[PDB]
């Protein structure tokens, strides 16, 4: 359950993208 | 990618948005 990044990246992406999920490379 | 870019430092919500599917 614990996080890897001091930024709390995974939690932050779960809120920004939701069930879309994310990819490692930005589209813009 | 995102791990190299948004993990040692906080990326903005605009930034994170660009990584979404």
């Amino acid at each position, epitope marked *: 359950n614990q996080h890897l990044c001091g930024s709390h990246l995974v939690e932050a992406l779960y809120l920004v993208c939701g069930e879309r999920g994310f990819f490692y490379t930005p589209k813009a | *990618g995102i*791990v190299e870019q948004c993990c040692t430092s906080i990326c903005s919500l605009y930034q994170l948005e660009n990584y979404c599917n």
Partner: antibody
Amino acid sequence: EVQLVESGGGLVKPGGSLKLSCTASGFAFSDYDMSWVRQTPEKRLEWVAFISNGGYSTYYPDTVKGRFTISRDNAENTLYLQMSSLKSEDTAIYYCARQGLRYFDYWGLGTTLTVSS
Amino acid sequence: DIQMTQSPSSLSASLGGRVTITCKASQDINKYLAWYQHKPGKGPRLLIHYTSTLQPGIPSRFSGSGSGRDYSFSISNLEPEDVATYYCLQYDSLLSFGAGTKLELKR
């Protein structure tokens, strides 16, 4: 003067192994996420493997997940694709491709794989 | 994934004419569509990103357009170098390619 040179293609029996290489020059290779994309005999383009610029992140479609491993040696400006459990459906030209953003912006000339008994 | 439907699969044109290719997405892809030209024996070459933004260097006779799910790519003043296979790519949700349009000469 961005250059990507694939190498290592050849013929392999089903179930065999092969390591493809890709030599980068003309740019800051360690800043770029990199992919392998293949073209099937029916001329479809198939995204095969992804690796982030620092090697932290990785992605594989289900068709090759568990059989392929993408890796990079940034100090040698080389992207790699280790394939194993090769199947005839893997027969294609394999391309090296650069992703500053998510869309590919540079490709190599390709290297050809044939999987056959 | 997102499925790209590309049409037509093959196309014949006359030198100096115009050609138009279509890509329909299975969902909205928010203009995140790229276009590639692929010639035999060479590697693909990026032409357009973000629906209509030309890569630097690419002749202005190339263009694209669209939104939502309906996009189109176009060649004005068809030149002999333009005979090739063209592919769209959506990169809004992961990555997926169109099946390709083979572009041949009329004679």
